[PDB]
Design a binder for these strands. Structure first.
Length: 50
DNA sequence: AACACTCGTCGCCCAGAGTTCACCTTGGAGCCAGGGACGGTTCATTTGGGGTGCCGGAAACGGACGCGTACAGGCCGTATAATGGGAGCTGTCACGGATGCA
């Protein structure tokens, strides 16, 4: 499933589509620590992803 | 061994990336209405053409028909005198019985 299908807000889509994350399969493959590593990552994005 | 200087690190503070959320337009995509000319169809010619069955007959042609020639096979005759075969090579044994003689 793509991350857009999760019907989320501005920042998470922006910071994901620049770097080529297209699905939630790679997102569930990546752990919370491996996804929070990104510079200027929103804590609200962390909350919604968790 | 005693003494007086300059550099990451972090937080914090303001501006937009660019994204979402969310407002007006206008070229529509199509839907329908109307008008050819057009190509498909059909039907009048149209006499240009294919057509032909048979023949006078001319000439080939297939064969009959009669009459010559050709070797193949057959018949026939040869007048000094010429008057009874070469050849075969045979080392069996058993043995039953006829068999020409006993």
């Amino acid at each position: 499933l793509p991350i857009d299908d999760l019907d989320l807000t501005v920042r998470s889509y922006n910071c994901l589509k620049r770097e080529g994350v297209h699905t939630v399969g790679e997102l569930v493959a990546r752990t919370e620590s491996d996804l929070l590593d990104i510079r200027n990552f929103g804590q609200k994005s962390i909350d919604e992803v968790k």
